[PDB]
């Protein structure tokens, strides 16, 4: 039933501190209910109740507390949590951080209201994602393959072409209808236009929804921006059977809003001063993915994050690492050499590749090829590190073949055009024509049956 009871409105602001405003005399505060604030000048803001205690409600104000006042500020308590109007009508539209429209279209008519927090998908109803998506990118489809409904982030150093990679996935991704949710947090306008323009250049724009929060929009709205995106993705996938892909852009600029809120609340700090709940907060984003029984929908997530000081062990990538189905890494050591897309296969993995490949999904050889490509690429890096100290005169002929493998591999397997789509089969054949650099017996990861069917060609 609808909430029929008339809304209260309080002037009883009794403190303000950082992004918090503390009400008093509140009649039965509800934890996590939303409050609208009117400032003395008639400006409207919104905020969530973070704590309640007897008559007190601690409200965090999304649009910042600057201009909140202890006498004239009016808080309309809405009486419920942060619901969002959702509809399939949100495809082909663009929204601000808090889900207000910015494409000059009207306010969304709700086909329903959903709780922004979503719900924990029941582990019994969840279906283990296995139907492969070809992204078209050899460094993915060959060695890091993505299942329909996987969650797998793209990690990057700063300034790397990770935007162009995500754009290419949103230009080439498909199975062996489809729709995209896109969200960006703390993005610069010089990149917001790139994403919006790319969905026009790909012709895709009619099947995609962009939630944009820019670096000069309010930082606390970034907390809800990816949650709005996921709530829309749940409506499209689980209510409407759409094969949804969710792009979350700079989870780092989201994580910085967590660190800010944490410091402002005085929460117990984990590594680098992120809140203790950092893992759970990231899970509350990243777990809304994968198929569920009876529903043909399948939320896939490709978060993107700039790793601070390029450090893989930083809390943002590292906690994301524990949650996601493996990770795709983009590297300066490739990008400086103009090797687009600069995806370094070696540190990458996909947890679901194990079941997304082989007969009925991909050619029989694929799993064996992937492992042997890791083996040779890795040994190539090891002999390169040897050559950099002791010179090529210390290397055996086989060690020089592993060095040549790494060179030929990066120039052919990883190197691909920004608009070039390669099938998995073409990627595997490039894999084999590189593996043929060694004698058949040297391919120690591959069984003799696979070698007899696929090595000689």
């Amino acid at each position: 039933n609808y909430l029929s009871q008339p809304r209260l409105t309080y002037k009883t602001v009794s403190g303000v501190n950082g992004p918090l405003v503390i009400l008093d005399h509140v009649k039965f505060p509800r934890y996590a209910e939303i409050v609208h604030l009117t400032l003395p000048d008639g400006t409207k803001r919104s905020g969530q109740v973070l704590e309640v205690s007897g008559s007190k409600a601690v409200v965090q104000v999304f649009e910042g507390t600057s201009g909140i006042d202890a006498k004239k500020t009016s808080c309309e308590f809405t009486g419920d949590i942060l619901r969002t109007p959702v509809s399939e009508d949100m495809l082909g539209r663009v929204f601000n951080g808090s889900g207000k429209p910015i494409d000059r279209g009207p306010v969304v008519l709700a086909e329903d209201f959903l709780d922004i927090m979503g719900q924990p998908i029941n582990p019994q109803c969840r279906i283990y994602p296995e139907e492969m998506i070809q992204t078209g990118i050899s460094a993915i489809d060959g060695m890091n393959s993505i299942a329909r409904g996987q969650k797998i982030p793209i990690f990057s150093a700063a300034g790397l072409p990770h935007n162009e990679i995500a754009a290419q996935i949103c230009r080439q991704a498909g199975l062996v209808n489809f729709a995209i949710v896109f969200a960006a947090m703390g993005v610069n306008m010089e990149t917001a236009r790139f994403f919006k323009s790319d969905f026009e250049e790909n012709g895709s724009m009619d099947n995609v929804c962009l939630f944009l929060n820019l670096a000069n929009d309010p930082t606390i709205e970034r907390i809800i921006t990816p949650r709005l995106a996921l709530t829309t993705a749940e409506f499209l996938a689980y209510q409407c059977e759409k094969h949804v892909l969710v792009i979350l852009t700079d989870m780092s600029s989201y994580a910085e809003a967590l660190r800010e809120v944490s410091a402002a609340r005085e929460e117990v700090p984990g590594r680098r001063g992120f809140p203790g709940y950092m893992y759970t907060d990231l899970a509350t984003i990243y777990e809304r993915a994968g198929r569920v029984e009876g529903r043909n929908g399948s939320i896939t997530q490709i978060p993107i994050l700039t790793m601070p000081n390029d450090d893989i062990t930083h809390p943002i990538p590292d906690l994301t690492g524990y949650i996601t189905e493996g990770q795709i890494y983009v590297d300066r050591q490739l990008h400086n050499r103009q090797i687009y897309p600069p995806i370094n296969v070696l540190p990458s993995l996909s947890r679901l590749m194990k079941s997304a490949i082989g007969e009925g999904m991909t050619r029989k050889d694929h799993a064996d090829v992937s492992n042997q490509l890791y083996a040779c690429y890795a040994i190539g890096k090891d002999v390169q590190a040897m050559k950099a100290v002791v010179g090529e005169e210390a290397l055996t002929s086989d060690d020089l073949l592993y060095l040549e493998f790494l060179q030929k591999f990066e120039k052919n397997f990883i190197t691909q055009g920004p608009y070039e789509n390669r099938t998995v089969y073409e990627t595997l054949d490039i894999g084999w024509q590189l593996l043929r650099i060694f004698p058949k017996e040297m391919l120690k990861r591959i069984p003799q049956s696979t070698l007899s069917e696929f090595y000689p060609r």
Binding site: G15, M189, L214, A215, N216, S253
Partner: protein
């Protein structure tokens, strides 16, 4: 109306009867009118961060609320002014007090009252006309180079009830009155804006035109767009003044702002002494750059809030000039010293350390500051475009880019002009390290270059490749000596040296290089690369021949072309016409083509 002091602890003053206050509302404290910002409300009590030293504040002293958060007065009288970070006029606080100090408790108005200016009302307007924020209802002729366009404040709208006739007016005069919802608003040539709030725009645009600095290395290899965001590693050993002076004294940017974040006291006085002595040519007259700028200078001992506000005052002044339809350009001398002011205010606020000591928000404050740049369609009706270009210097400890302010800055800025102490020790001015430096605006200038300089993108690409090849070849020269290199490698190294020494390098004290136009820059590089391609043609074309061409044969039979290529820098945009320079460069193209034909 006003409150009273209740307690003091260091710089933090608690007050009472503050019921009608707001967080970040600006407040005057004490009988001496000390400035401070509210940082907490606790009911009818409020806590004020005082800026100046609180020594001698007393319980029960008056606490006047200012009707505004921290804010910048905008209007006539900005030009040639020197402000501090909280918008107090350091030239007038000097001349009015006759004191060498900023007295504790200044109350001087930021745009000086009683100074009349010549105001022209916009003759297109009438009483009863509709008007909106950003509409140019008149112009003030405050200086010959910069017609100050007055405009309706962004929050204001309505119907004109009265406008002043043409004449002489000042900030106390009610230049405009308008009505909306039955309520009149009175207005003046002075406007006020909250310093931490962006001035809104009709549309922020994609940046697509070069901020021509008149400096070859910058303008060719690392072009910054007008409205672009850029960083300079500002350190004593690398000559940060060279870029900042050249930008001001020549570059294609209608108005300059310069923000002292928190500079060393002497180095700040160096800038404030020196800038008034710089002059730029306009309309064939020579005039002081003080006609086209304002300086927001903070020495390290200015209050913590005045340092952290410094860049926000600077950008707010710069956005006001952007909304007049000017291509503004703003320096920040050390975003690192501004980031220290953030660390300190967060320390006094007792907020938790994030990265290395800095606040959690350092990255967000930097990013939401740099986003205030760009080209824009202005508010209001005369449809003008404008821009703000931000040139934010950084000072990484020992050059280590992992430093949080430097790392976040390089994360956000699209151009880095990496000055280097090694190049400065070799006197390779402008001393920009072309290997470390970069620009992300190359794509965005394709449209401009395709129209005006259609060959230049090929030339730039070849130039960077030639220089990069010489850096790789230098390892082989160390391993096995110059004699061991192939002929193609040797000519590449010689040409890369020519590009390095006679194109990248530029002596800004000489009449020929004090500035260097873009057409000059293109023509010089075009000749060096045309020579490279034809020299390399003769070498490669005589692969497997009986007699093979080499750089030594080219130097023997046509070293006059190498001498001429090095000489092309001496051409003077004052004494030589543009057509004369282009003709001499075209003559060197013909000369070298005939010289190459004598070999191949």
């Amino acid at each position: 109306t006003f409150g009273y002091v209740h307690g003091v602890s260091g710089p933090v003053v608690t007050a009472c009867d503050m019921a009608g206050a707001a967080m970040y509302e600006l407040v005057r404290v004490g009988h001496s009118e000390l400035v401070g910002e509210i940082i907490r409300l606790e009911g009818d009590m409020a806590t004020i961060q005082v800026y100046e030293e609180t020594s001698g504040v007393s319980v029960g002293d008056p606490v006047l609320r200012t009707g505004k958060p921290l804010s910048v007065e905008l209007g006539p009288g900005i030009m040639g002014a020197i402000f501090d970070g909280i918008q107090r006029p350091l030239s007038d606080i000097s001349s009015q007090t006759q004191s060498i100090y900023i007295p504790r408790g200044v109350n001087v108005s930021a745009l000086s009252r009683d100074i009349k200016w010549e105001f022209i009302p916009s003759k297109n307007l009438r009483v009863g006309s509709h008007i909106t924020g950003g509409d140019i209802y008149g112009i003030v002729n405050e200086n010959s180079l910069i017609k100050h366009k007055i405009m309706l404040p962004p929050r204001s709208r309505g119907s004109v009830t009265y406008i002043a006739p043409p004449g002489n007016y000042d900030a106390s005069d009610v230049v405009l009155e308008l009505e909306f919802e039955g309520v009149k608003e009175k207005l003046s040539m002075v406007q006020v804006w909250p310093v931490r709030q962006v001035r809104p725009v009709t549309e922020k645009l994609p940046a697509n035109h070069p901020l021509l600095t008149g400096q070859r290395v910058l303008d060719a290899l690392f072009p910054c767009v007008q409205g672009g965001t850029t960083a300079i590693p500002g350190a004593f050993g690398c000559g940060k003044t060279v870029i900042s002076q050249s930008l001001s004294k020549y570059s294609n940017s209608d108005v300059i702002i310069y923000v002292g974040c928190g500079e060393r006291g002497n180095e700040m006085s160096e800038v404030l002494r020196d800038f008034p002595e710089l002059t730029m040519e306009v309309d064939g007259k020579v005039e002081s750059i003080m006609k086209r700028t304002a300086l927001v200078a903070n020495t390290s001992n200015m209050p913590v809030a005045a340092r952290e506000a410094s860049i926000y005052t600077g950008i707010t002044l710069s956005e006001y000039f952007r909304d007049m339809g000017y291509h503004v350009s703003m320096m920040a001398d050390s975003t690192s010293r501004w980031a220290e002011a953030l660390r300190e205010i967060s320390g006094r606020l007792a907020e938790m350390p994030a990265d290395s000591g800095y606040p959690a928000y350092l990255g967000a404050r930097l990013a939401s500051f740099y986003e205030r740049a760009g080209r824009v369609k202005c508010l209001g009706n005369p449809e003008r475009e404008g821009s703000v270009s931000i040139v934010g210097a950084v000072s990484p400890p020992g050059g280590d880019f992992s430093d949080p302010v430097t790392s976040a800055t390089l994360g956000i800025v699209q151009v880095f002009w990496g000055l280097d102490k090694k190049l400065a020790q070799r006197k390779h001015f402008p001393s920009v390290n072309w290997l470390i430096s970069y620009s992300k605006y190359m794509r965005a200038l394709d449209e401009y270059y395709d129209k005006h300089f259609t060959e230049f993108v090929p030339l730039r690409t070849k130039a960077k490749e030639i220089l990069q090849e010489e850096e790789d070849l230098a390892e082989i020269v160390q391993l096995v000596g110059k004699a061991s290199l192939a002929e193609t490698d040797k000519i590449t190294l010689e040409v890369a040296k020519l590009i390095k020494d006679d194109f990248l390098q530029q002596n800004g004290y000489t009449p020929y290089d004090r500035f260097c136009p873009f057409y000059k820059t293109v023509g010089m590089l075009s000749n060096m690369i045309s020579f490279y391609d034809m020299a390399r043609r003769a070498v490669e074309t005589t692969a497997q021949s009986d007699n093979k061409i080499t750089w030594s044969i080219i130097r023997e039979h046509m070293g006059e072309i190498l001498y001429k290529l090095s000489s092309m820098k001496f051409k003077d945009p004052v004494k030589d016409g543009e057509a004369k320079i282009k003709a001499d460069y075209a003559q060197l193209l013909e000369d070298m083509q005939n010289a190459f034909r004598s070999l191949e």
